[PDB]
């Protein structure tokens, strides 16, 4: 599998993606169902169900019968913070002059590998 | 598991890391053994052996009895190119003003999520 540090960083990125996904789903279609999450992640339903229980254990999500998944106050803030980091990187790349599509693409995959000091540096760039 | 596009990007990053690792090992200790590769990757020996056969099939590596693993001309160039991309990102972050340690860290994890247009933009930055 791998070094503890790397697995822990990978777990963190998964958590962020899951809570951002849930918020985006509620915001776009009004609900976040397990089947829709699975389809939008590209994974089976069993693995989504598996991650949801981990999230509940971390007090990040609440599951309601016939209504799907929702975020808790802690989970919604976590999603807001991830989104914010992705935006800082995206805006930085836009200031650099990268096409809007590519800027948004790279920012999504890059953010999780950007240290805090680097993100600050990106933010710094006002121009 | 996931979307084809994502799995293919992940496979690519693994290939680069493996060939860079092999070149770095030969350069630092004169040889690249499976047990040392496994230990330095944080994975078991079975998975390294598994990836090595995939690399041989791609004509990227050659395995020699009692001598370990070596790269082919194609494999050595692939490693040189990965290293180069990591360097472009690292230098870019240094120009930005990020500490040497963090610059090298983020560049390693970032490069695989940086599109070509973005890398050019990074290179562009001369300052």
The CATH code of the domain that includes A126 is: 1.10.60.10
Put simply, whether A99 touches B (Cβ < 8 Å) is: yes
Is A71:A61 a contact under the CB 8 Å cutoff? yes
Task: Tell me the sheet residues that pair with A71.
Answer: A61
Best residue of A106, A108, A116, A123 to probe chain B, by most B CBs closer than 10 Å: A106
Specify whether B30 is located in the same domain as B4. yes
Q: Specify the experimental method.
A: X-ray
Specify whether A66 is located in the same domain as A7. yes
Put simply, whether A49 touches B (Cβ < 8 Å) is: no
User: Which tokens sit at B6?
Assistant: 């994502």
Specify whether B45 is located in the same domain as B107. no
Distance of CA B4 to the CA centre of its chain: 21
Put simply, whether B117 touches A (Cβ < 8 Å) is: yes
Domains contained in chain A, number: 2
Q: Distance (Å, rounded) from C-alpha B105 to C-alpha B8?
A: 24
Specify whether B3 is located in the same domain as B61. yes
Put simply, whether B127 touches A (Cβ < 8 Å) is: no
Specify whether B40 is located in the same domain as B95. no
Q: Which of B96, B97, B102 sits opposite A115 (nearest CB)?
A: B102
Chain B residues with CB under 8 Å of A1 CB are 42-43
Q: Distance (Å, rounded) from C-alpha B55 to C-alpha B61?
A: 6
Secondary structure, 3-state, chain A:
CCCHHHHHHHHHHHHHHHHHHHHHHHHHHCCCCHHHHHHHHCCCHHHHHHHHHHHHHCCCEEEECCCEEEECHHHHHHHHHHHHHHHHHHHHHHHHCCCHHHHHHHHHHHHHHCCHHHHHHHHHCCC
Chain A residues with CB under 8 Å of B102 CB are 115, 117-118
Specify whether B54 is located in the same domain as B76. no
Put simply, whether B95 touches A (Cβ < 8 Å) is: no
Specify whether B6 is located in the same domain as B61. yes
Specify whether B99 is located in the same domain as B119. yes
Count of other CB atoms within 10 angstroms of residue A124:
11
- The CATH number given to whatever domain includes residue A28 is 1.10.10.10
Q: What are phi and psi of A63, to 5 degrees?
A: -110, 130
Specify whether A40 is located in the same domain as A85. no
Specify whether A45 is located in the same domain as A98. no
Please name the residue that has the structure tokens 């790397």.
A6
Specify whether A85 is located in the same domain as A46. no
Q: How far is CA B25 from CA A1, A96, B20, B40, B59, in A?
A: 21, 36, 8, 10, 19
Provide the residue range defining the domain that includes B115: 72-127
Burial classification of residue A46, based on how many CB atoms lie within 10 Å of its CB (0-12 exposed, 13-18 middle, 19 or more buried): exposed
Q: Distance (Å, rounded) from C-alpha B39 to C-alpha B80?
A: 23
Within a 13 Å sphere around the CA of A37, how many CA atoms are in the beta-carbon half?
A: 25
> Which of A28, A34, A17 is CA-nearest to residue B6?
A17
Instruction: Out of B49, B71, B93, pick the residue that ends a domain.
Output: B71
Specify whether A103 is located in the same domain as A54. no
């Amino acid at each position: 599998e791998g070094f503890r540090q790397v697995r822990e960083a990978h777990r963190r990125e998964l958590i962020d993606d899951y809570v951002e996904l849930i918020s985006d789903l509620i915001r776009e279609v009004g609900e976040a169902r397990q089947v829709d999450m699975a389809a939008r992640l590209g994974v089976s339903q069993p693995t989504v169900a598996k991650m949801l229980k981990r999230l509940a254990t971390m007090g990040l999500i609440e599951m309601i019968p016939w209504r799907g998944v929702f975020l808790t106050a802690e989970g919604e803030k976590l999603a807001q913070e991830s989104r914010e980091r992705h935006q800082i990187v995206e805006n930085f790349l836009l200031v650099l002059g990268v096409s809007p599509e590519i800027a948004r693409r790279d920012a999504e995959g890059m953010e999780h590998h950007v240290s805090e000091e680097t993100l600050d540096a990106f933010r710094l760039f006002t121009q």
